[model samples]
Target: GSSGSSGGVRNLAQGPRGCEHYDRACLLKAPCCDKLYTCRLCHDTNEDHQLDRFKVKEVQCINCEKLQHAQQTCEDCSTLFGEYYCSICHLFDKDKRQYHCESCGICRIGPKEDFFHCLKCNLCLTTNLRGKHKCIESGPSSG
Candidate 1:
């Protein structure tokens, strides 16, 4: 038998905790499976269920392997997980000036000027491409 620490497999997870999807210093703790994975994409790919990023509440710091509440800084090792953190989405990524739109329910890229969410189309479009194609409704989504 094995020691019943629950998380017996302490992955030698160090150096970096990032993958192709994002640049980060921590691994998300999946609430659905009570396991750790590099990202939601990897969890869904390997496991039977899909991992919703929003549902996650804890994280395993790559440096110290300490599981703590999700945030930009690791409590155990004090490593800066990422410069950009979307609390609503529970997303951690490099600082690219990302902003979250409440109704869209996702992080939208922002220099804070180059893009705008189109309510009619329900999509974020480049500032210049205001009306390449007509939206399902009217209005330019000028907010």
Candidate 2:
């Protein structure tokens, strides 16, 4: 008979001192490890009864898989849209800019574009179109 620990398997059941076998079983079922962390990179044994708090040491997927900081594949359905939206400022692409949002539509100035942020309306507008922001005036929608 061969012990389960024979082939690269460490007996998680016989873990650190004072740690109960049932607790180890539960931790094995649960990982007590942060998905944003890795056993090779760091140890999360400091956390008790649950997974450790996510530590952003590396720019990686922060949920569902604990392989490395940056996961090449997604284990969950959370998605990143084409543009970032900010509700607090009611502005789109406040964090990153793919285009400038002015009024209701985007703006393109020749080959160059600039992003405009309006704190009063808490909105962002892309205005380029060779200075076309004043050419068109659109009021807020009534709902």
Candidate 3:
């Protein structure tokens, strides 16, 4: 996964979601390699096969010898690794500035009151643009 070193400053955490590499236990299981990595970028930079971010389904907790869905704590060990964890989507973030949208089925970084979950687009948009933005199909798309 991460070379077992915590000294380097990594930008592998920021994305459509919040930070993912906030602690030692936070790791991504690259679908292409079927191996664990610190983040999607780490796998893409080191492996020939690139990993799709949304396709990721699992993450291993370094604190516990258990493989579970991406979460802030080891389900088995109960060792919390970060500040924010969404039980709904199992997303972890260190900033603790995240909120879950049941309609979107994802965690978004912002105040719950400042954003509104769109049922049609299946995304969380700012309160001001809740019903004003262009509509597009949610989920996987042709790339």
Per-candidate TM equals 0.74, 0.19, 0.53
Better of 1 and 3 by TM-score: 1
Instruction: State the local distance difference test value for candidate 3.
Output: 0.65
Q: Of the candidates numbered 2 and 3, which has the greater lDDT value?
A: 3
lDDT of each: 0.80, 0.31, 0.65
RMSD to the hidden true structure, all candidates: 9.7, 17.5, 10.8
Q: Ten residues in a row with the worst lDDT in model 2?
A: 21-30
lDDT of 3 by residue, 48-143 (tens): 878866677677776655788866677888876567765554445566566766676766778777877666666677888966697875677677
Write the residue-wise lDDT of candidate 1 on 40-96 in tens digits. Answer: 787887799999898887777888878788799987678888888778888888876
lDDT of 2 by residue, 68-124 (tens): 222223335342211333222212121232443445344222222455655445455
User: Which pairs of residues clash in candidate 3, taking residues 3 or more apart in a chain or in different chains?
Assistant: none
Cand. 2 TM to true fold: 0.19
**Which structure among the candidates has the greatest lDDT?**
1
For model 1, where is the 10-residue window of minimal lDDT?
A: 7-16
